[PDB]
Write a protein that binds this ligand. Structure first.
Ligand SMILES: [Cl-]
Lengths: 100, 97
């Protein structure tokens, strides 16, 4: 679930990690600091750090920012896994955050 | 960078580009081992490793990156390194020429 704090990657304020794969611009959201730091541990030298979006306002500002970055999807809890990746459309997340 | 280049390919022209630091970046590997190890840890991205042996295959690769506004590529990227190796696409481009 996406309720609860979202953990994302951020360099200088506002510069979030955007990756181009699957024919789109993707960012990432992790559902726990451990999962995000784990991913961070496997991707150094990108000037990134884990950032926590604890409030509705911060989660909201984050989505707006993904929009400014023209990102229409985010991978949820991405990691070297066995299950098909979880890709959420930003348009869908903008609806979800209204539950928070 | 004299030898064969190992790169990632997905949809045509689609390479793995990441926005970090101040610009757009991709990745190039000198070892098939490092490239395949990186790919193994990055599943679900529809990527595959392909080898660029020709000077003409390296050029076609860099020009696609150039048009995708990718100004630099990470050389032999992998976790547990002190610092990363970065090469301007413009440099590699002129070099290959
Ligand atoms: Cl860093």
């Amino acid at each position: 679930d996406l309720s609860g704090t979202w953990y994302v990657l951020e360099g200088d304020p506002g510069e979030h990690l955007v990756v181009e794969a699957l024919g789109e611009r993707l960012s990432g959201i992790w559902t726990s600091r451990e999962l995000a730091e784990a991913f961070l541990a496997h991707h150094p030298h990108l000037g990134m750090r884990v950032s926590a979006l604890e409030s509705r306002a911060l989660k909201e500002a984050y989505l707006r920012a993904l929009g400014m970055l023209q990102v229409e999807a985010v991978m949820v809890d991405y990691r070297p896994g066995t299950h098909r990746a979880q890709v959420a459309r930003v348009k869908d997340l903008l609806e979800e955050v209204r539950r928070a």
